[PDB]
Design an enzyme around this catalytic site. Structure first.
Site, PDB file in Angstrom:
ATOM      1  N   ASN A 265      11.910  23.904 -49.494  1.00  0.00           N
ATOM      2  CA  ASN A 265      11.244  24.476 -48.406  1.00  0.00           C
ATOM      3  C   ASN A 265      11.078  23.081 -48.139  1.00  0.00           C
ATOM      4  O   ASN A 265      10.922  22.305 -48.895  1.00  0.00           O
ATOM      5  CB  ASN A 265      10.168  24.738 -48.303  1.00  0.00           C
ATOM      6  CG  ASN A 265       9.790  24.952 -46.786  1.00  0.00           C
ATOM      7  OD1 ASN A 265      10.664  25.686 -46.039  1.00  0.00           O
ATOM      8  ND2 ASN A 265       8.543  24.932 -46.166  1.00  0.00           N
TER       9      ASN A 265
ATOM     10  N   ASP B  93      10.346  22.128 -56.634  1.00  0.00           N
ATOM     11  CA  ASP B  93       9.426  22.646 -54.819  1.00  0.00           C
ATOM     12  C   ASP B  93       9.315  24.826 -55.422  1.00  0.00           C
ATOM     13  O   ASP B  93       9.321  25.092 -56.615  1.00  0.00           O
ATOM     14  CB  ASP B  93       9.691  22.835 -53.542  1.00  0.00           C
ATOM     15  CG  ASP B  93       9.213  22.837 -52.284  1.00  0.00           C
ATOM     16  OD1 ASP B  93       7.333  22.787 -53.163  1.00  0.00           O
ATOM     17  OD2 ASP B  93       9.449  23.243 -51.552  1.00  0.00           O
ATOM     18  N   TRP B  94       9.808  25.394 -54.262  1.00  0.00           N
ATOM     19  CA  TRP B  94      10.005  27.010 -54.190  1.00  0.00           C
ATOM     20  C   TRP B  94      10.695  27.287 -55.004  1.00  0.00           C
ATOM     21  O   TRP B  94      10.950  27.900 -56.152  1.00  0.00           O
ATOM     22  CB  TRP B  94       9.879  27.041 -53.269  1.00  0.00           C
ATOM     23  CG  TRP B  94       8.546  27.170 -52.662  1.00  0.00           C
ATOM     24  CD1 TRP B  94       8.267  26.261 -51.275  1.00  0.00           C
ATOM     25  CD2 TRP B  94       6.962  28.016 -52.801  1.00  0.00           C
ATOM     26  NE1 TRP B  94       6.260  27.010 -51.057  1.00  0.00           N
ATOM     27  CE2 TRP B  94       6.141  28.047 -52.107  1.00  0.00           C
ATOM     28  CE3 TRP B  94       7.424  29.364 -54.052  1.00  0.00           C
ATOM     29  CZ2 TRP B  94       4.894  28.388 -52.596  1.00  0.00           C
ATOM     30  CZ3 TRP B  94       6.284  30.529 -54.082  1.00  0.00           C
ATOM     31  CH2 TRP B  94       5.013  29.148 -53.629  1.00  0.00           C
TER      32      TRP B  94
ATOM     33  N   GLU C 290       8.351  17.404 -59.277  1.00  0.00           N
ATOM     34  CA  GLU C 290       7.828  17.736 -57.941  1.00  0.00           C
ATOM     35  C   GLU C 290       7.926  19.196 -58.020  1.00  0.00           C
ATOM     36  O   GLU C 290       8.145  19.707 -56.617  1.00  0.00           O
ATOM     37  CB  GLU C 290       7.852  17.316 -56.306  1.00  0.00           C
ATOM     38  CG  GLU C 290       7.920  15.776 -56.568  1.00  0.00           C
ATOM     39  CD  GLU C 290       6.214  15.267 -56.089  1.00  0.00           C
ATOM     40  OE1 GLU C 290       6.203  16.212 -54.921  1.00  0.00           O
ATOM     41  OE2 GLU C 290       5.220  15.040 -56.699  1.00  0.00           O
TER      42      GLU C 290
ATOM     43  N   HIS D 282       8.216  13.511 -51.753  1.00  0.00           N
ATOM     44  CA  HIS D 282       8.705  14.714 -52.433  1.00  0.00           C
ATOM     45  C   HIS D 282      10.212  15.484 -52.814  1.00  0.00           C
ATOM     46  O   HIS D 282      10.036  16.194 -53.736  1.00  0.00           O
ATOM     47  CB  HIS D 282       7.678  15.754 -51.097  1.00  0.00           C
ATOM     48  CG  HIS D 282       7.528  17.312 -51.784  1.00  0.00           C
ATOM     49  ND1 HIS D 282       7.542  18.138 -53.343  1.00  0.00           N
ATOM     50  CD2 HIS D 282       8.905  18.838 -51.212  1.00  0.00           C
ATOM     51  CE1 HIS D 282       8.087  19.425 -53.276  1.00  0.00           C
ATOM     52  NE2 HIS D 282       8.982  19.230 -52.383  1.00  0.00           N
TER      53      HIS D 282
END
Length: 290
Positions: free
Chosen positions: A38, A103-104, A127, A269
Protein backbone atom coordinates in the site's frame (compact mmCIF):
# COMPACT_ATOMS: atom_id res chain seq x y z
CA UNK A 1 16.83 6.57 -10.45
CA UNK A 2 14.55 5.68 -13.38
CA UNK A 3 11.07 7.23 -13.55
CA UNK A 4 9.85 5.23 -16.59
CA UNK A 5 7.94 1.92 -16.60
CA UNK A 6 9.30 0.17 -19.74
CA UNK A 7 7.40 -3.15 -19.33
CA UNK A 8 4.94 -4.80 -21.72
CA UNK A 9 1.58 -5.14 -19.86
CA UNK A 10 0.12 -8.60 -19.21
CA UNK A 11 -3.35 -9.53 -17.83
CA UNK A 12 -4.65 -12.85 -16.51
CA UNK A 13 -8.27 -13.40 -15.52
CA UNK A 14 -8.57 -14.17 -11.81
CA UNK A 15 -11.96 -14.95 -10.22
CA UNK A 16 -13.74 -12.92 -12.92
CA UNK A 17 -11.31 -9.97 -12.61
CA UNK A 18 -8.23 -9.10 -14.77
CA UNK A 19 -4.97 -8.68 -12.83
CA UNK A 20 -2.12 -6.82 -14.51
CA UNK A 21 1.47 -8.15 -14.12
CA UNK A 22 4.99 -7.55 -15.43
CA UNK A 23 6.49 -10.70 -16.93
CA UNK A 24 10.07 -10.38 -18.22
CA UNK A 25 13.23 -12.49 -18.33
CA UNK A 26 13.95 -16.10 -19.45
CA UNK A 27 11.13 -18.76 -19.25
CA UNK A 28 12.42 -22.13 -17.94
CA UNK A 29 13.78 -21.93 -14.37
CA UNK A 30 12.31 -20.73 -11.06
CA UNK A 31 10.34 -17.43 -11.29
CA UNK A 32 10.87 -14.48 -8.92
CA UNK A 33 7.49 -13.14 -7.73
CA UNK A 34 7.54 -9.47 -6.60
CA UNK A 35 4.66 -8.41 -4.31
CA UNK A 36 4.03 -4.69 -3.60
CA UNK A 37 1.77 -3.25 -0.89
CA UNK A 38 0.00 0.00 0.00
CA UNK A 39 -0.41 2.29 -1.89
CA UNK A 40 1.90 1.05 -4.65
CA UNK A 41 1.94 -1.36 -7.61
CA UNK A 42 4.47 -3.19 -9.78
CA UNK A 43 5.79 0.40 -10.47
CA UNK A 44 7.55 0.06 -7.08
CA UNK A 45 9.77 -2.70 -8.57
CA UNK A 46 10.62 -0.91 -11.91
CA UNK A 47 14.32 -0.28 -11.05
CA UNK A 48 14.89 -3.54 -9.13
CA UNK A 49 13.58 -5.95 -11.81
CA UNK A 50 16.25 -5.03 -14.46
CA UNK A 51 19.02 -6.40 -12.16
CA UNK A 52 17.20 -9.75 -11.86
CA UNK A 53 15.60 -10.19 -15.34
CA UNK A 54 18.87 -11.08 -17.20
CA UNK A 55 19.10 -14.38 -15.22
CA UNK A 56 15.57 -15.07 -13.89
CA UNK A 57 11.87 -14.68 -14.85
CA UNK A 58 10.40 -11.65 -12.99
CA UNK A 59 6.65 -11.68 -12.30
CA UNK A 60 5.19 -8.59 -10.60
CA UNK A 61 1.36 -8.46 -10.25
CA UNK A 62 -0.70 -5.39 -9.34
CA UNK A 63 -2.93 -6.39 -6.41
CA UNK A 64 -6.69 -6.43 -7.06
CA UNK A 65 -8.10 -2.88 -6.92
CA UNK A 66 -4.63 -1.37 -7.45
CA UNK A 67 -2.22 -0.47 -10.25
CA UNK A 68 -3.68 -1.50 -13.64
CA UNK A 69 -5.71 -4.43 -12.23
CA UNK A 70 -9.52 -4.39 -12.27
CA UNK A 71 -11.33 -2.65 -9.40
CA UNK A 72 -14.26 -4.77 -8.07
CA UNK A 73 -16.64 -3.27 -5.46
CA UNK A 74 -15.07 -5.11 -2.50
CA UNK A 75 -14.34 -4.26 1.14
CA UNK A 76 -10.65 -5.02 0.26
CA UNK A 77 -9.97 -6.87 3.53
CA UNK A 78 -6.68 -8.80 3.68
CA UNK A 79 -8.67 -12.02 3.04
CA UNK A 80 -9.90 -10.59 -0.30
CA UNK A 81 -6.30 -10.00 -1.45
CA UNK A 82 -5.36 -13.52 -0.26
CA UNK A 83 -8.07 -15.14 -2.48
CA UNK A 84 -7.05 -13.14 -5.64
CA UNK A 85 -3.29 -13.71 -5.17
CA UNK A 86 -3.82 -17.45 -4.53
CA UNK A 87 -5.82 -17.60 -7.76
CA UNK A 88 -3.25 -15.53 -9.72
CA UNK A 89 -0.38 -17.88 -8.80
CA UNK A 90 -2.44 -20.92 -9.90
CA UNK A 91 -3.69 -19.09 -13.03
CA UNK A 92 -0.07 -18.77 -14.26
CA UNK A 93 0.59 -22.44 -13.35
CA UNK A 94 3.50 -21.53 -11.08
CA UNK A 95 5.12 -24.47 -9.27
CA UNK A 96 8.06 -23.30 -7.13
CA UNK A 97 8.84 -19.59 -6.65
CA UNK A 98 11.23 -17.11 -5.05
CA UNK A 99 9.33 -14.37 -3.20
CA UNK A 100 10.40 -10.72 -3.19
CA UNK A 101 8.00 -8.95 -0.84
CA UNK A 102 7.12 -5.68 0.93
CA UNK A 103 4.44 -4.34 3.32
CA UNK A 104 1.04 -5.95 2.54
CA UNK A 105 2.83 -7.90 -0.19
CA UNK A 106 4.91 -9.48 2.60
CA UNK A 107 1.81 -10.43 4.63
CA UNK A 108 0.46 -12.05 1.45
CA UNK A 109 3.79 -13.70 0.58
CA UNK A 110 4.52 -15.05 4.07
CA UNK A 111 0.95 -16.34 4.46
CA UNK A 112 1.18 -18.08 1.06
CA UNK A 113 4.63 -19.47 2.02
CA UNK A 114 3.34 -20.91 5.32
CA UNK A 115 0.49 -22.68 3.41
CA UNK A 116 2.79 -23.81 0.51
CA UNK A 117 6.25 -24.24 2.15
CA UNK A 118 7.43 -26.85 -0.41
CA UNK A 119 6.94 -24.29 -3.27
CA UNK A 120 9.03 -21.42 -1.76
CA UNK A 121 12.73 -21.53 -2.72
CA UNK A 122 13.68 -18.22 -1.11
CA UNK A 123 12.25 -15.04 0.42
CA UNK A 124 13.75 -11.58 -0.11
CA UNK A 125 11.89 -9.17 2.16
CA UNK A 126 11.95 -5.55 3.29
CA UNK A 127 9.86 -3.38 5.60
CA UNK A 128 7.55 -6.36 6.14
CA UNK A 129 4.49 -6.67 8.37
CA UNK A 130 5.00 -8.07 11.92
CA UNK A 131 2.77 -7.68 15.04
CA UNK A 132 3.06 -4.14 16.49
CA UNK A 133 2.21 -4.71 20.20
CA UNK A 134 1.76 -0.98 21.04
CA UNK A 135 1.78 2.40 19.26
CA UNK A 136 5.16 3.09 20.98
CA UNK A 137 6.72 0.71 18.41
CA UNK A 138 5.28 2.87 15.60
CA UNK A 139 7.62 5.77 14.59
CA UNK A 140 6.75 9.03 16.40
CA UNK A 141 6.96 10.92 13.08
CA UNK A 142 3.87 9.02 11.81
CA UNK A 143 1.98 8.00 15.04
CA UNK A 144 -0.84 10.59 15.03
CA UNK A 145 -1.29 10.19 11.25
CA UNK A 146 -1.88 6.42 11.31
CA UNK A 147 -3.91 6.73 14.54
CA UNK A 148 -6.14 9.13 12.57
CA UNK A 149 -6.28 6.66 9.63
CA UNK A 150 -7.78 4.10 12.12
CA UNK A 151 -10.26 6.63 13.63
CA UNK A 152 -13.93 6.55 12.56
CA UNK A 153 -14.82 9.20 9.91
CA UNK A 154 -11.43 10.98 10.12
CA UNK A 155 -9.60 8.03 8.51
CA UNK A 156 -11.86 7.88 5.40
CA UNK A 157 -11.77 11.72 5.17
CA UNK A 158 -7.94 11.69 5.01
CA UNK A 159 -7.43 8.64 2.76
CA UNK A 160 -10.50 8.68 0.45
CA UNK A 161 -11.43 12.39 0.22
CA UNK A 162 -7.93 13.95 0.46
CA UNK A 163 -5.92 10.98 -0.96
CA UNK A 164 -3.51 11.16 2.02
CA UNK A 165 -1.90 7.77 1.38
CA UNK A 166 -0.73 8.89 -2.08
CA UNK A 167 -0.14 12.59 -1.39
CA UNK A 168 1.34 12.45 2.15
CA UNK A 169 2.45 8.92 3.15
CA UNK A 170 4.47 8.12 -0.03
CA UNK A 171 6.72 11.26 0.10
CA UNK A 172 6.87 10.98 3.93
CA UNK A 173 8.25 7.40 3.74
CA UNK A 174 10.83 7.95 0.95
CA UNK A 175 14.06 9.58 2.17
CA UNK A 176 15.00 11.15 -1.23
CA UNK A 177 12.46 13.52 -2.91
CA UNK A 178 10.08 11.86 -5.42
CA UNK A 179 9.76 13.56 -8.83
CA UNK A 180 6.44 14.77 -10.24
CA UNK A 181 6.59 12.02 -12.89
CA UNK A 182 6.89 9.34 -10.18
CA UNK A 183 3.98 10.82 -8.18
CA UNK A 184 1.81 10.83 -11.35
CA UNK A 185 2.53 7.11 -11.85
CA UNK A 186 1.41 6.38 -8.23
CA UNK A 187 -1.62 8.79 -8.64
CA UNK A 188 -2.95 7.15 -11.86
CA UNK A 189 -4.89 4.18 -10.32
CA UNK A 190 -6.69 6.42 -7.77
CA UNK A 191 -7.79 9.50 -9.75
CA UNK A 192 -11.41 8.61 -8.83
CA UNK A 193 -11.86 8.99 -5.01
CA UNK A 194 -14.16 5.91 -4.75
CA UNK A 195 -11.29 3.65 -5.95
CA UNK A 196 -9.21 4.53 -2.80
CA UNK A 197 -11.09 1.94 -0.65
CA UNK A 198 -8.09 -0.49 -0.52
CA UNK A 199 -5.80 2.40 0.54
CA UNK A 200 -8.03 3.03 3.61
CA UNK A 201 -8.72 -0.63 4.59
CA UNK A 202 -5.01 -1.62 4.54
CA UNK A 203 -3.93 0.67 7.46
CA UNK A 204 -7.09 -0.53 9.30
CA UNK A 205 -5.92 -4.16 8.85
CA UNK A 206 -2.45 -3.51 10.37
CA UNK A 207 -1.84 -5.72 13.47
CA UNK A 208 -1.48 -2.83 15.97
CA UNK A 209 -2.35 -2.99 19.70
CA UNK A 210 -3.87 -6.46 19.25
CA UNK A 211 -6.44 -5.33 16.62
CA UNK A 212 -7.80 -6.51 14.35
CA UNK A 213 -7.39 -9.78 16.33
CA UNK A 214 -7.72 -12.06 13.27
CA UNK A 215 -4.86 -10.35 11.38
CA UNK A 216 -2.69 -10.35 14.53
CA UNK A 217 -3.26 -14.12 14.83
CA UNK A 218 -2.53 -14.66 11.12
CA UNK A 219 0.68 -12.59 11.18
CA UNK A 220 1.83 -14.29 14.41
CA UNK A 221 1.24 -17.62 12.64
CA UNK A 222 3.45 -16.83 9.57
CA UNK A 223 6.14 -15.24 11.78
CA UNK A 224 6.24 -18.49 13.82
CA UNK A 225 6.58 -20.42 10.55
CA UNK A 226 9.24 -17.98 9.29
CA UNK A 227 11.32 -18.30 12.48
CA UNK A 228 11.54 -22.10 12.02
CA UNK A 229 11.72 -22.29 8.20
CA UNK A 230 15.07 -23.34 6.61
CA UNK A 231 14.19 -21.45 3.38
CA UNK A 232 16.97 -18.95 2.43
CA UNK A 233 16.12 -15.35 3.41
CA UNK A 234 17.43 -11.95 2.32
CA UNK A 235 16.35 -9.01 4.54
CA UNK A 236 16.80 -5.41 3.36
CA UNK A 237 16.60 -2.66 5.96
CA UNK A 238 17.18 1.07 6.29
CA UNK A 239 17.78 3.73 8.93
CA UNK A 240 15.60 4.71 10.65
CA UNK A 241 12.97 2.52 8.91
CA UNK A 242 9.26 2.36 9.75
CA UNK A 243 8.08 -1.25 10.25
CA UNK A 244 11.62 -2.66 10.66
CA UNK A 245 13.91 -0.22 12.57
CA UNK A 246 17.69 -1.00 12.72
CA UNK A 247 17.36 -2.65 16.18
CA UNK A 248 14.59 -4.94 14.88
CA UNK A 249 16.62 -5.89 11.77
CA UNK A 250 19.52 -6.73 14.14
CA UNK A 251 17.27 -9.11 16.20
CA UNK A 252 15.90 -10.69 12.98
CA UNK A 253 19.46 -11.12 11.64
CA UNK A 254 20.15 -13.45 14.60
CA UNK A 255 16.74 -15.13 14.99
CA UNK A 256 15.65 -15.82 11.39
CA UNK A 257 17.25 -19.09 10.11
CA UNK A 258 19.40 -18.98 6.94
CA UNK A 259 19.12 -15.18 6.74
CA UNK A 260 21.43 -12.56 5.20
CA UNK A 261 20.78 -8.87 5.96
CA UNK A 262 21.53 -5.95 3.64
CA UNK A 263 21.79 -2.37 4.97
CA UNK A 264 20.47 -0.06 2.20
CA UNK A 265 21.64 3.13 3.96
CA UNK A 266 19.03 5.87 4.69
CA UNK A 267 15.52 4.40 4.39
CA UNK A 268 12.00 4.71 5.74
CA UNK A 269 9.30 2.42 4.31
CA UNK A 270 9.54 2.45 0.43
CA UNK A 271 13.20 1.31 0.44
CA UNK A 272 12.86 0.47 -3.27
CA UNK A 273 12.68 4.22 -4.02
CA UNK A 274 15.83 4.96 -1.99
CA UNK A 275 18.28 2.24 -3.12
CA UNK A 276 16.78 0.11 -5.95
CA UNK A 277 20.22 -0.75 -7.39
CA UNK A 278 21.51 -2.30 -4.16
CA UNK A 279 18.23 -4.19 -3.65
CA UNK A 280 18.30 -5.48 -7.25
CA UNK A 281 22.02 -6.28 -7.40
CA UNK A 282 21.91 -8.21 -4.08
CA UNK A 283 18.84 -10.21 -5.12
CA UNK A 284 20.69 -11.06 -8.37
CA UNK A 285 23.89 -12.11 -6.47
CA UNK A 286 21.77 -14.16 -4.00
CA UNK A 287 19.56 -16.14 -6.44
CA UNK A 288 22.21 -18.50 -7.98
CA UNK A 289 23.04 -19.74 -4.42
CA UNK A 290 19.42 -20.97 -4.02
Amino acid sequence: IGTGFPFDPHYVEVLGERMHYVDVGPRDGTPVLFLHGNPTSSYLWRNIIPHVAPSHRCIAPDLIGMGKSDKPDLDYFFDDHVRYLDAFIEALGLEEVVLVIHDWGSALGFHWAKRNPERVKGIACMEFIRPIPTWDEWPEFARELFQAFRTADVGRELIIDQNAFIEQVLPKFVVRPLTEVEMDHYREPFLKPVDREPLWRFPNELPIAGEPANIVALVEAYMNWLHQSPVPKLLFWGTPGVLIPPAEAARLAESLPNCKTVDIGPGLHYLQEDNPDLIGSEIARWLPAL
